[PDB]
Design a protein around this ligand. Structure first.
Ligand SMILES: Nc1ncnc2c1ncn2[C@@H]1O[C@H](COP(=O)(O)OP(=O)(O)OP(=O)(O)O)[C@@H](O)[C@H]1O
Length: 413
């Protein structure tokens, strides 16, 4: 329901665009330009649609409100963008100030400008850390002076940075322009999560994985008000199993605090006519380590002392397959085993295999931006599923029922 890039007339207008350029980079090298490739459609569309200019702002790393051009500069990204675009980019040493305003006042037609790391200013995030790592706070008055500067730099504002739309930062909620719209990536993020929330197709399956239960209560609860089925994997499972199946979980992880909301969750599951499924057998390790001895266990046998459950097993994979294959909409957030290690990634991979199969068969599949979005990368299925969120933190909040400021800041119609 929010304004989008292709619905705005960018004829002869300057465009201030907030994009995701937080790329892994060691020594100003950039070890994965993926996120930079991703923003090109939006920028291209602006040039191709008559934009006088396009001003790009972003952040990279953890400078926490201190300019740090030596390790978190966007400069290496600015000329990496030139390569990818086969067009020169003008890098500005800062993101605000007199120089930055003149440079973007009335640029030559079609020029592309990239401002320095926004987080070099404590006003962007609204918080920070000084020379000794201690937390400092931005002055609400300087924050608004910073935002007044950023707004001048453009005539139309475009947010194509979903990954930080769950945080009301300056670049996200502070640009005051008549039209604030979603970029092509952002638009896609919204288009799909809108599906899994406004009026989902059924059967709607929610696969929730992860380590602790305490920080998934909201996500679990909000999903129970919408889905038909729900699978819970990952370390969480052991908390529910010990509490619902009197299972000896050995030395597996256990969320003591979350264990007290279990019965509250199962209630929710019942009032909403949903039946959660958990593993039934497990792949174990004699220690939380990649090359640990691998063993097997079931709910009945439980994990031996010392050992711990690290991935679901053969019967769990089968049950999972059956349920995945009967869904029209699947939302997957969180692997169901320690995917970082192959000895215990089988369950997660099998699930991926099945989910990809569901996409081919008409099922819309949505993946969380965190640990799950990287799984598609490690196994090239980023183009075999309906959607892979480009932002873990934001997708989690969206799926939790929380308000995403960056989004509500966008214009309507
Ligand atoms: N059976 C398990 N035992 C111990 N740790 C596990 C197990 N399964 C998964 N994990 C761990 O869960 C960790 C992530 O936990 P956390 O809940 O913080 O993120 P998450 O639930 O995976 O969310 P997301 O996938 O969106 O980033 C992974 O790094 C993985 O190592």
């Amino acid at each position: 329901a929010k304004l989008t890039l292709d619905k705005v007339d960018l004829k002869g207008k300057r465009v201030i665009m907030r994009v995701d350029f937080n790329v892994p980079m060691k020594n100003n090298q950039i070890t994965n330009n993926q996120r930079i490739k991703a923003a090109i459609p939006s920028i291209k569309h602006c040039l191709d649609n008559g934009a006088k200019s396009v001003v790009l702002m972003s952040h990279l790393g953890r400078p926490d409100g201190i300019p740090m051009p030596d390790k978190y500069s966007l400069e290496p990204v600015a000329d990496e963008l030139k390569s990818l675009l086969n067009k020169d980019v003008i890098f500005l040493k800062d993101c605000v100030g007199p120089e930055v305003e003149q440079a973007c006042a009335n640029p030559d037609n079609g020029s592309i400008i990239l401002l320095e790391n926004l987080r070099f200013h404590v006003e962007e995030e609204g918080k920070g850390k000084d020379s000794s790592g201690k937390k400092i706070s931005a002055d609400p008055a300087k924050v608004e002076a910073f935002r007044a500067s950023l707004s001048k730099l453009g005539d139309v504002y475009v947010n194509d940075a979903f990954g930080t739309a769950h945080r009301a930062h300056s670049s996200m909620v502070g640009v005051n322009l008549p039209q604030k719209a979603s970029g092509f990536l952002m638009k896609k993020e919204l288009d799909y999560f809108s599906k899994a929330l406004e009026k989902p197709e059924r059967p709607f399956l929610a696969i929730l994985g992860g380590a602790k239960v305490k920080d998934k209560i909201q996500l679990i609860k909000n999903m129970l008000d919408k889905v038909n089925f729900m699978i819970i994997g990952g370390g969480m499972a052991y908390t529910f199993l010990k509490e619902l199946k009197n299972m000896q979980i050995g030395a597996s992880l256990f969320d003591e605090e979350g264990a007290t909301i279990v019965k509250e969750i199962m209630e929710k599951a019942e009032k909403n006519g949903v039946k959660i499924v958990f593993p039934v057998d497990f792949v174990t390790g004699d220690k939380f380590d990649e090359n640990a001895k691998v063993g097997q266990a079931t709910i009945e046998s439980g994990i031996p002392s010392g050992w711990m459950g690290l991935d679901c097993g053969p019967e769990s994979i089968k049950i999972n397959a059956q349920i995945v294959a009967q869904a029209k909409l699947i939302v997957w957030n969180g692997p169901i085993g320690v995917f970082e290690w192959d000895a215990f990634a089988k369950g997660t991979k099998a699930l991926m295999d099945e989910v990809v199969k569901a996409t081919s068969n008409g099922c819309v599949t949505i993946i969380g931006g965190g640990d799950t979005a990287t799984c598609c990368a490690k196994w090239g299925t980023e183009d075999k599923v309906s959607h892979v969120s480009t932002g873990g933190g934001a997708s989690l909040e969206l799926l939790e029922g929380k308000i995403l400021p960056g989004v509500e800041a966008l214009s309507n119609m």
